[PDB]
mmCIF file of C-alpha atoms and ligand atoms in Angstrom:
data_model
loop_
_atom_site.group_PDB
_atom_site.id
_atom_site.type_symbol
_atom_site.label_atom_id
_atom_site.label_comp_id
_atom_site.label_asym_id
_atom_site.label_seq_id
_atom_site.Cartn_x
_atom_site.Cartn_y
_atom_site.Cartn_z
ATOM 1 C CA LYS H 3 -95.576 -102.594 82.113
ATOM 2 C CA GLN H 4 -93.761 -105.028 84.419
ATOM 3 C CA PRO H 5 -91.547 -103.768 87.313
ATOM 4 C CA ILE H 6 -88.296 -105.722 87.626
ATOM 5 C CA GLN H 7 -87.077 -107.722 84.655
ATOM 6 C CA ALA H 8 -85.416 -111.056 83.835
ATOM 7 C CA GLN H 9 -81.845 -111.223 85.166
ATOM 8 C CA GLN H 10 -82.796 -108.423 87.562
ATOM 9 C CA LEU H 11 -85.156 -110.402 89.749
ATOM 10 C CA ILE H 12 -82.660 -113.260 89.589
ATOM 11 C CA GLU H 13 -79.921 -110.988 90.923
ATOM 12 C CA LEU H 14 -82.287 -109.712 93.586
ATOM 13 C CA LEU H 15 -83.309 -113.166 94.740
ATOM 14 C CA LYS H 16 -79.713 -114.445 94.865
ATOM 15 C CA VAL H 17 -78.606 -111.384 96.841
ATOM 16 C CA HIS H 18 -81.273 -111.362 99.553
ATOM 17 C CA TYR H 19 -82.401 -114.989 99.694
ATOM 18 C CA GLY H 20 -79.245 -116.809 98.633
ATOM 19 C CA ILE H 21 -81.334 -118.739 96.154
ATOM 20 C CA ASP H 22 -80.062 -119.531 92.685
ATOM 21 C CA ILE H 23 -82.889 -118.791 90.246
ATOM 22 C CA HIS H 24 -82.334 -119.752 86.596
ATOM 23 C CA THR H 25 -85.755 -118.768 85.219
ATOM 24 C CA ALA H 26 -88.103 -116.071 86.498
ATOM 25 C CA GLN H 27 -91.325 -115.306 84.616
ATOM 26 C CA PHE H 28 -93.815 -112.521 85.148
ATOM 27 C CA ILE H 29 -97.504 -113.331 85.677
ATOM 28 C CA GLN H 30 -100.275 -111.008 84.470
ATOM 29 C CA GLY H 31 -101.838 -110.174 87.852
ATOM 30 C CA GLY H 32 -103.083 -112.563 90.525
ATOM 31 C CA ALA H 33 -104.241 -110.394 93.446
ATOM 32 C CA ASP H 34 -103.653 -106.707 92.630
ATOM 33 C CA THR H 35 -102.632 -104.444 95.551
ATOM 34 C CA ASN H 36 -99.751 -102.706 93.711
ATOM 35 C CA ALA H 37 -98.242 -106.230 93.760
ATOM 36 C CA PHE H 38 -96.810 -107.960 90.663
ATOM 37 C CA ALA H 39 -96.106 -111.660 90.707
ATOM 38 C CA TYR H 40 -93.328 -113.733 89.223
ATOM 39 C CA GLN H 41 -92.568 -117.444 89.039
ATOM 40 C CA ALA H 42 -88.866 -117.805 89.737
ATOM 41 C CA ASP H 43 -87.467 -121.308 89.528
ATOM 42 C CA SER H 44 -84.350 -122.683 91.148
ATOM 43 C CA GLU H 45 -82.542 -125.792 90.010
ATOM 44 C CA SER H 46 -85.210 -127.800 91.859
ATOM 45 C CA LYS H 47 -87.778 -125.590 93.601
ATOM 46 C CA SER H 48 -90.228 -123.111 92.065
ATOM 47 C CA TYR H 49 -91.031 -119.988 94.052
ATOM 48 C CA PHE H 50 -93.841 -117.467 93.947
ATOM 49 C CA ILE H 51 -92.379 -114.004 94.118
ATOM 50 C CA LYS H 52 -94.400 -110.968 94.959
ATOM 51 C CA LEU H 53 -93.366 -107.298 94.669
ATOM 52 C CA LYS H 54 -95.402 -104.657 96.501
ATOM 53 C CA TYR H 55 -95.454 -100.860 96.133
ATOM 54 C CA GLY H 56 -98.221 -98.336 96.840
ATOM 55 C CA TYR H 57 -101.124 -99.989 98.647
ATOM 56 C CA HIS H 58 -98.774 -102.896 99.276
ATOM 57 C CA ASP H 59 -96.397 -102.322 102.210
ATOM 58 C CA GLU H 60 -98.253 -102.983 105.484
ATOM 59 C CA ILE H 61 -98.213 -105.504 108.372
ATOM 60 C CA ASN H 62 -100.398 -108.584 107.760
ATOM 61 C CA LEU H 63 -97.470 -110.966 108.055
ATOM 62 C CA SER H 64 -98.159 -110.386 111.751
ATOM 63 C CA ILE H 65 -101.042 -112.785 111.208
ATOM 64 C CA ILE H 66 -99.483 -115.518 109.099
ATOM 65 C CA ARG H 67 -96.852 -115.707 111.797
ATOM 66 C CA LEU H 68 -99.589 -115.812 114.401
ATOM 67 C CA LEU H 69 -101.345 -118.429 112.293
ATOM 68 C CA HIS H 70 -98.284 -120.516 111.521
ATOM 69 C CA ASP H 71 -97.554 -120.273 115.228
ATOM 70 C CA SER H 72 -101.070 -121.390 116.012
ATOM 71 C CA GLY H 73 -100.369 -124.442 113.850
ATOM 72 C CA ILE H 74 -102.349 -123.976 110.646
ATOM 73 C CA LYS H 75 -100.572 -125.735 107.777
ATOM 74 C CA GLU H 76 -103.323 -124.718 105.346
ATOM 75 C CA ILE H 77 -101.424 -121.451 104.950
ATOM 76 C CA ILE H 78 -98.610 -120.582 102.594
ATOM 77 C CA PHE H 79 -95.666 -119.492 104.778
ATOM 78 C CA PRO H 80 -93.100 -117.046 103.297
ATOM 79 C CA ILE H 81 -89.506 -117.980 102.460
ATOM 80 C CA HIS H 82 -87.141 -116.305 104.966
ATOM 81 C CA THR H 83 -84.579 -113.822 103.706
ATOM 82 C CA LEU H 84 -80.904 -114.146 104.574
ATOM 83 C CA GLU H 85 -81.360 -111.393 107.166
ATOM 84 C CA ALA H 86 -83.710 -113.989 108.659
ATOM 85 C CA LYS H 87 -86.804 -112.022 107.686
ATOM 86 C CA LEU H 88 -90.055 -112.861 105.906
ATOM 87 C CA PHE H 89 -89.653 -110.034 103.412
ATOM 88 C CA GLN H 90 -87.144 -107.725 101.764
ATOM 89 C CA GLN H 91 -87.753 -103.984 101.824
ATOM 90 C CA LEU H 92 -86.204 -102.035 98.980
ATOM 91 C CA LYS H 93 -86.390 -98.215 98.796
ATOM 92 C CA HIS H 94 -88.989 -98.565 96.030
ATOM 93 C CA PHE H 95 -90.780 -101.865 96.684
ATOM 94 C CA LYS H 96 -91.197 -104.886 98.965
ATOM 95 C CA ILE H 97 -90.176 -108.467 98.141
ATOM 96 C CA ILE H 98 -92.167 -111.409 99.458
ATOM 97 C CA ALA H 99 -91.256 -114.888 98.219
ATOM 98 C CA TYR H 100 -93.372 -117.985 98.713
ATOM 99 C CA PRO H 101 -92.861 -121.573 97.717
ATOM 100 C CA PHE H 102 -94.727 -121.891 94.415
ATOM 101 C CA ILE H 103 -98.015 -123.813 94.393
ATOM 102 C CA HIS H 104 -99.684 -125.130 91.223
ATOM 103 C CA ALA H 105 -103.280 -125.572 92.263
ATOM 104 C CA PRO H 106 -106.418 -124.326 90.588
ATOM 105 C CA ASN H 107 -108.229 -121.955 92.901
ATOM 106 C CA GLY H 108 -111.802 -122.584 93.942
ATOM 107 C CA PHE H 109 -113.348 -121.029 90.867
ATOM 108 C CA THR H 110 -112.169 -123.810 88.601
ATOM 109 C CA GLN H 111 -111.603 -126.468 91.254
ATOM 110 C CA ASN H 112 -114.396 -127.837 93.406
ATOM 111 C CA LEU H 113 -113.848 -129.302 96.849
ATOM 112 C CA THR H 114 -114.438 -132.843 97.997
ATOM 113 C CA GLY H 115 -116.670 -133.238 101.022
ATOM 114 C CA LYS H 116 -113.499 -134.179 102.868
ATOM 115 C CA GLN H 117 -111.949 -130.911 101.734
ATOM 116 C CA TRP H 118 -115.141 -129.086 102.575
ATOM 117 C CA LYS H 119 -114.840 -130.432 106.123
ATOM 118 C CA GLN H 120 -111.160 -129.583 106.232
ATOM 119 C CA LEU H 121 -111.918 -126.004 105.276
ATOM 120 C CA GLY H 122 -114.532 -125.789 108.008
ATOM 121 C CA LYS H 123 -112.004 -127.067 110.497
ATOM 122 C CA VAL H 124 -109.400 -124.499 109.454
ATOM 123 C CA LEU H 125 -111.778 -121.540 109.387
ATOM 124 C CA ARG H 126 -112.528 -122.602 112.968
ATOM 125 C CA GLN H 127 -108.893 -123.078 114.046
ATOM 126 C CA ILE H 128 -108.478 -119.530 112.755
ATOM 127 C CA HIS H 129 -111.654 -118.059 114.224
ATOM 128 C CA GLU H 130 -110.482 -119.472 117.543
ATOM 129 C CA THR H 131 -106.800 -118.548 117.315
ATOM 130 C CA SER H 132 -106.372 -116.007 120.115
ATOM 131 C CA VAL H 133 -105.165 -112.555 119.067
ATOM 132 C CA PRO H 134 -102.533 -110.708 121.129
ATOM 133 C CA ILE H 135 -103.772 -107.381 122.499
ATOM 134 C CA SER H 136 -100.968 -105.647 120.563
ATOM 135 C CA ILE H 137 -102.197 -107.294 117.367
ATOM 136 C CA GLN H 138 -105.846 -106.350 117.995
ATOM 137 C CA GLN H 139 -104.733 -102.735 118.134
ATOM 138 C CA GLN H 140 -103.965 -102.860 114.419
ATOM 139 C CA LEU H 141 -106.480 -105.168 112.808
ATOM 140 C CA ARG H 142 -109.365 -103.171 111.425
ATOM 141 C CA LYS H 143 -112.610 -103.806 113.272
ATOM 142 C CA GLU H 144 -116.206 -104.273 112.194
ATOM 143 C CA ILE H 145 -117.864 -100.855 112.416
ATOM 144 C CA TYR H 146 -120.705 -101.166 109.896
ATOM 145 C CA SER H 147 -119.595 -98.011 108.124
ATOM 146 C CA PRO H 148 -122.230 -96.674 105.675
ATOM 147 C CA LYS H 149 -119.299 -95.635 103.529
ATOM 148 C CA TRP H 150 -120.294 -98.101 100.851
ATOM 149 C CA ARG H 151 -124.013 -97.654 101.182
ATOM 150 C CA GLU H 152 -123.542 -93.920 100.703
ATOM 151 C CA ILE H 153 -121.252 -94.166 97.660
ATOM 152 C CA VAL H 154 -123.885 -96.337 95.961
ATOM 153 C CA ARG H 155 -126.676 -93.874 96.650
ATOM 154 C CA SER H 156 -124.559 -91.241 94.936
ATOM 155 C CA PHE H 157 -124.808 -93.022 91.570
ATOM 156 C CA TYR H 158 -128.651 -92.969 91.498
ATOM 157 C CA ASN H 159 -128.946 -89.416 90.036
ATOM 158 C CA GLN H 160 -126.010 -90.087 87.708
ATOM 159 C CA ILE H 161 -127.587 -92.549 85.269
ATOM 160 C CA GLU H 162 -128.688 -90.828 82.053
ATOM 161 C CA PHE H 163 -127.472 -89.984 78.544
ATOM 162 C CA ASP H 164 -124.332 -87.889 78.234
ATOM 163 C CA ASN H 165 -122.585 -87.886 74.868
ATOM 164 C CA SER H 166 -119.574 -87.604 77.170
ATOM 165 C CA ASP H 167 -120.022 -91.396 77.553
ATOM 166 C CA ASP H 168 -118.459 -94.194 75.510
ATOM 167 C CA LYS H 169 -119.769 -97.682 74.686
ATOM 168 C CA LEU H 170 -118.662 -99.261 77.966
ATOM 169 C CA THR H 171 -119.732 -96.449 80.292
ATOM 170 C CA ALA H 172 -123.022 -96.775 78.401
ATOM 171 C CA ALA H 173 -123.801 -100.471 78.825
ATOM 172 C CA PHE H 174 -123.099 -100.046 82.520
ATOM 173 C CA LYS H 175 -125.316 -96.973 82.756
ATOM 174 C CA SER H 176 -128.048 -99.129 81.236
ATOM 175 C CA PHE H 177 -127.368 -102.322 83.144
ATOM 176 C CA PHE H 178 -127.578 -100.174 86.226
ATOM 177 C CA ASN H 179 -131.083 -98.948 85.307
ATOM 178 C CA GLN H 180 -132.245 -102.330 84.125
ATOM 179 C CA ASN H 181 -131.577 -103.447 87.729
ATOM 180 C CA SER H 182 -132.320 -100.186 89.600
ATOM 181 C CA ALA H 183 -134.870 -101.783 91.921
ATOM 182 C CA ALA H 184 -132.764 -104.774 92.979
ATOM 183 C CA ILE H 185 -129.852 -102.500 93.818
ATOM 184 C CA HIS H 186 -131.877 -100.124 95.988
ATOM 185 C CA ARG H 187 -133.080 -103.271 97.762
ATOM 186 C CA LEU H 188 -129.496 -104.106 98.562
ATOM 187 C CA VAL H 189 -128.689 -100.676 99.972
ATOM 188 C CA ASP H 190 -131.957 -100.286 101.888
ATOM 189 C CA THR H 191 -131.589 -103.792 103.283
ATOM 190 C CA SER H 192 -127.915 -103.587 104.206
ATOM 191 C CA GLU H 193 -128.963 -100.401 105.978
ATOM 192 C CA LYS H 194 -132.046 -101.898 107.616
ATOM 193 C CA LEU H 195 -130.071 -104.915 108.821
ATOM 194 C CA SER H 196 -127.368 -102.559 109.980
ATOM 195 C CA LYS H 197 -129.790 -101.202 112.568
ATOM 196 C CA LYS H 198 -131.112 -104.543 113.806
ATOM 197 C CA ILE H 199 -127.595 -105.611 114.824
ATOM 198 C CA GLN H 200 -126.470 -105.027 118.421
ATOM 199 C CA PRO H 201 -122.657 -104.886 118.144
ATOM 200 C CA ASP H 202 -120.602 -107.105 120.487
ATOM 201 C CA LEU H 203 -116.830 -106.683 120.444
ATOM 202 C CA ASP H 204 -116.630 -109.862 122.517
ATOM 203 C CA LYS H 205 -118.068 -112.222 119.901
ATOM 204 C CA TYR H 206 -115.568 -110.790 117.408
ATOM 205 C CA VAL H 207 -112.912 -113.226 116.163
ATOM 206 C CA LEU H 208 -110.028 -113.126 113.680
ATOM 207 C CA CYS H 209 -111.503 -113.293 110.165
ATOM 208 C CA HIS H 210 -110.139 -113.503 106.624
ATOM 209 C CA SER H 211 -112.299 -110.563 105.542
ATOM 210 C CA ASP H 212 -112.898 -111.983 102.013
ATOM 211 C CA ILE H 213 -112.625 -115.818 102.033
ATOM 212 C CA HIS H 214 -114.340 -116.952 98.849
ATOM 213 C CA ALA H 215 -113.634 -119.798 96.447
ATOM 214 C CA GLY H 216 -111.187 -117.407 94.833
ATOM 215 C CA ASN H 217 -108.873 -117.659 97.837
ATOM 216 C CA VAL H 218 -108.880 -121.385 98.474
ATOM 217 C CA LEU H 219 -106.239 -123.205 96.474
ATOM 218 C CA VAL H 220 -107.552 -126.719 96.038
ATOM 219 C CA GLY H 221 -104.647 -129.133 95.963
ATOM 220 C CA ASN H 222 -104.213 -132.918 95.808
ATOM 221 C CA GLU H 223 -106.538 -133.984 98.647
ATOM 222 C CA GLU H 224 -105.437 -132.303 101.826
ATOM 223 C CA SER H 225 -103.273 -129.744 100.107
ATOM 224 C CA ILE H 226 -105.804 -126.937 100.337
ATOM 225 C CA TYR H 227 -104.505 -123.451 101.171
ATOM 226 C CA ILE H 228 -106.200 -120.250 102.205
ATOM 227 C CA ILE H 229 -104.351 -117.405 100.574
ATOM 228 C CA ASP H 230 -104.593 -113.605 100.600
ATOM 229 C CA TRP H 231 -104.067 -112.278 104.074
ATOM 230 C CA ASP H 232 -103.610 -108.612 103.203
ATOM 231 C CA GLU H 233 -106.694 -107.175 104.885
ATOM 232 C CA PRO H 234 -107.669 -109.582 107.688
ATOM 233 C CA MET H 235 -109.940 -108.213 110.388
ATOM 234 C CA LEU H 236 -111.762 -108.687 113.657
ATOM 235 C CA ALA H 237 -115.483 -109.295 113.189
ATOM 236 C CA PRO H 238 -118.343 -111.647 114.059
ATOM 237 C CA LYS H 239 -117.579 -115.038 112.520
ATOM 238 C CA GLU H 240 -120.466 -114.307 110.116
ATOM 239 C CA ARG H 241 -118.023 -111.993 108.311
ATOM 240 C CA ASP H 242 -116.389 -115.163 107.018
ATOM 241 C CA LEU H 243 -119.185 -117.698 107.336
ATOM 242 C CA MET H 244 -121.363 -115.758 104.878
ATOM 243 C CA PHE H 245 -119.284 -117.179 102.033
ATOM 244 C CA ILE H 246 -120.326 -120.746 102.675
ATOM 245 C CA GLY H 247 -123.299 -121.092 100.358
ATOM 246 C CA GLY H 248 -122.701 -117.445 99.445
ATOM 247 C CA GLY H 249 -122.366 -118.034 95.727
ATOM 248 C CA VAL H 250 -119.337 -115.807 95.051
ATOM 249 C CA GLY H 251 -117.857 -116.684 91.667
ATOM 250 C CA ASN H 252 -121.052 -118.592 91.005
ATOM 251 C CA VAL H 253 -119.676 -121.512 93.030
ATOM 252 C CA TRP H 254 -119.918 -122.393 96.730
ATOM 253 C CA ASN H 255 -123.684 -122.318 96.223
ATOM 254 C CA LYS H 256 -124.753 -125.922 96.638
ATOM 255 C CA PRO H 257 -126.600 -126.527 99.920
ATOM 256 C CA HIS H 258 -125.080 -129.993 100.406
ATOM 257 C CA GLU H 259 -121.526 -128.618 100.619
ATOM 258 C CA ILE H 260 -122.561 -126.366 103.504
ATOM 259 C CA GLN H 261 -123.231 -129.497 105.526
ATOM 260 C CA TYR H 262 -119.777 -130.834 104.733
ATOM 261 C CA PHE H 263 -118.333 -127.532 105.802
ATOM 262 C CA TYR H 264 -120.068 -127.226 109.178
ATOM 263 C CA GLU H 265 -119.047 -130.817 109.825
ATOM 264 C CA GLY H 266 -115.470 -129.688 110.174
ATOM 265 C CA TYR H 267 -116.158 -126.230 111.600
ATOM 266 C CA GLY H 268 -118.392 -127.860 114.162
ATOM 267 C CA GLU H 269 -121.970 -126.607 113.990
ATOM 268 C CA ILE H 270 -122.576 -123.742 116.374
ATOM 269 C CA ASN H 271 -124.804 -120.670 116.541
ATOM 270 C CA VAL H 272 -124.781 -118.300 113.621
ATOM 271 C CA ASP H 273 -126.578 -114.965 113.637
ATOM 272 C CA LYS H 274 -128.614 -115.023 110.433
ATOM 273 C CA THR H 275 -129.313 -111.315 110.766
ATOM 274 C CA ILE H 276 -125.526 -110.775 110.734
ATOM 275 C CA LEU H 277 -124.953 -113.469 108.117
ATOM 276 C CA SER H 278 -127.589 -111.934 105.887
ATOM 277 C CA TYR H 279 -126.102 -108.456 106.491
ATOM 278 C CA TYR H 280 -122.661 -109.381 105.224
ATOM 279 C CA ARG H 281 -124.043 -111.038 102.111
ATOM 280 C CA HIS H 282 -125.795 -107.768 101.364
ATOM 281 C CA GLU H 283 -123.147 -105.221 102.404
ATOM 282 C CA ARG H 284 -120.499 -107.080 100.421
ATOM 283 C CA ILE H 285 -122.521 -106.778 97.238
ATOM 284 C CA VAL H 286 -123.086 -103.087 98.041
ATOM 285 C CA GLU H 287 -119.373 -102.390 98.340
ATOM 286 C CA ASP H 288 -118.741 -104.355 95.123
ATOM 287 C CA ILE H 289 -121.384 -102.230 93.370
ATOM 288 C CA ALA H 290 -119.778 -99.183 94.930
ATOM 289 C CA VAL H 291 -116.237 -100.098 93.960
ATOM 290 C CA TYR H 292 -117.118 -101.280 90.454
ATOM 291 C CA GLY H 293 -119.431 -98.314 90.058
ATOM 292 C CA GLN H 294 -116.836 -95.599 90.715
ATOM 293 C CA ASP H 295 -114.572 -97.438 88.307
ATOM 294 C CA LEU H 296 -117.113 -97.016 85.525
ATOM 295 C CA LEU H 297 -117.982 -93.375 86.283
ATOM 296 C CA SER H 298 -115.748 -90.279 86.343
ATOM 297 C CA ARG H 299 -112.518 -90.281 84.319
ATOM 298 C CA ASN H 300 -112.037 -93.181 81.839
ATOM 299 C CA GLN H 301 -108.385 -93.023 82.952
ATOM 300 C CA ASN H 302 -108.718 -96.489 84.525
ATOM 301 C CA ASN H 303 -109.050 -97.947 81.017
ATOM 302 C CA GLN H 304 -108.246 -101.674 80.816
ATOM 303 C CA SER H 305 -109.672 -102.619 84.225
ATOM 304 C CA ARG H 306 -113.154 -101.176 83.944
ATOM 305 C CA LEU H 307 -113.651 -103.961 81.417
ATOM 306 C CA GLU H 308 -113.517 -106.485 84.246
ATOM 307 C CA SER H 309 -115.281 -104.355 86.851
ATOM 308 C CA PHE H 310 -118.332 -104.371 84.577
ATOM 309 C CA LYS H 311 -117.951 -108.080 83.929
ATOM 310 C CA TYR H 312 -117.908 -109.036 87.627
ATOM 311 C CA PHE H 313 -120.565 -106.437 88.250
ATOM 312 C CA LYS H 314 -123.005 -108.196 85.943
ATOM 313 C CA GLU H 315 -122.210 -111.706 87.156
ATOM 314 C CA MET H 316 -123.361 -110.735 90.636
ATOM 315 C CA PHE H 317 -126.836 -110.650 89.088
ATOM 316 C CA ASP H 318 -126.657 -113.918 87.181
ATOM 317 C CA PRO H 319 -128.713 -116.977 88.204
ATOM 318 C CA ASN H 320 -127.792 -118.447 91.577
ATOM 319 C CA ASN H 321 -125.071 -115.860 92.085
ATOM 320 C CA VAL H 322 -124.530 -113.632 95.116
ATOM 321 C CA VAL H 323 -127.603 -111.457 94.543
ATOM 322 C CA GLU H 324 -130.020 -114.330 94.076
ATOM 323 C CA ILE H 325 -128.737 -115.964 97.274
ATOM 324 C CA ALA H 326 -128.748 -112.809 99.376
ATOM 325 C CA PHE H 327 -132.417 -112.081 98.624
ATOM 326 C CA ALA H 328 -133.253 -115.773 99.118
ATOM 327 C CA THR H 329 -132.540 -115.417 102.818
ATOM 328 C CA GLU H 330 -132.162 -119.098 103.827
ATOM 329 C CA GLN H 331 -130.995 -120.530 107.204
HETATM 330 N N1 LIG S 1 -103.544 -120.416 91.288
HETATM 331 C C1 LIG S 1 -102.895 -121.479 90.534
HETATM 332 C C2 LIG S 1 -101.409 -121.717 90.922
HETATM 333 N N2 LIG S 1 -100.457 -120.619 91.369
HETATM 334 S S1 LIG S 1 -100.904 -118.958 91.433
HETATM 335 O O1 LIG S 1 -99.999 -118.220 90.587
HETATM 336 O O2 LIG S 1 -102.268 -118.755 91.057
HETATM 337 C C3 LIG S 1 -100.749 -118.247 93.083
HETATM 338 C C4 LIG S 1 -101.654 -117.181 93.416
HETATM 339 C C5 LIG S 1 -101.607 -116.554 94.700
HETATM 340 C C6 LIG S 1 -100.653 -116.971 95.679
HETATM 341 CL CL1 LIG S 1 -100.662 -116.162 97.206
HETATM 342 C C7 LIG S 1 -99.719 -118.039 95.380
HETATM 343 C C8 LIG S 1 -98.744 -118.478 96.341
HETATM 344 C C9 LIG S 1 -97.847 -119.542 95.981
HETATM 345 N N3 LIG S 1 -97.866 -120.177 94.744
HETATM 346 C C10 LIG S 1 -98.818 -119.744 93.815
HETATM 347 C C11 LIG S 1 -99.765 -118.684 94.078
HETATM 348 NI NI1 LIG S 2 -94.734 -124.908 108.584
#
């Protein structure tokens, strides 16, 4: 169930990057976007290899270049290919090598105040980094699409017994009821907030659409990195800021770290109506995405196991749902 194989990746790497890899293992996942990851090692340097297919090939590297250019070291820059490129397109898939980084992500590695400040500084460097007109005309933009809200509302009349349902699809069906009220409150609120917000395409900055503890690699002491730049966007800073104290992953939910963060980001003016909105909409979408996954055709077997898992966590103590409803500064 793995694309390339042993000596095959090695041959690929050596052909397009002129690197001599002796070992090249396959990793079970990482950040799935039709992208498999491998840890290829050279006589002295380890590399993180990524192969993209379907919802993979795009143009986000237009940002990491813009960001590297802007001078943000807290980003993992791609290894150039012999044709002097940052990737290697191959009829079937795309190759994107990175220097390998061993560093627990934020879900198993907390940040030191210092690091919390450093993150705040970077998120700011980024939020400030000017975006070329030609780049803006690409980046998706905050529209407040009810896409997600609507998909969730669909489920409502779809929760009931149907022998055509197995164990898993069942627990979910039930967990959904058991929390029926809370969920409607997320849709009806995300919607309500949606109306109270007067858009302003001028206060929109470059944002890492989904910057949670899962995408901060916490290294030695300054070696923090903000990974996953597949779907960056242009939105009010609150699109990113909502994660600080947001509780995603059941971490990043300790009020005192928020202070540390704004220290580096430099305390400014945050729209709490917008901040609150994102915390709600995000959960909606998650419910939407996970929902579909657990309703329809059990064809997505071995996946739906996790969807359900994450789905439930959202409701655990001091997790994203608790925090959203506890609308605090
Ligand atoms: N996360 C612990 C250490 N390495 S890793 O496989 O998870 C990993 C995940 C995601 C990205 Cl983008 C990477 C980039 C470079 N090295 C390791 C990377
Ligand atoms: Ni550099």
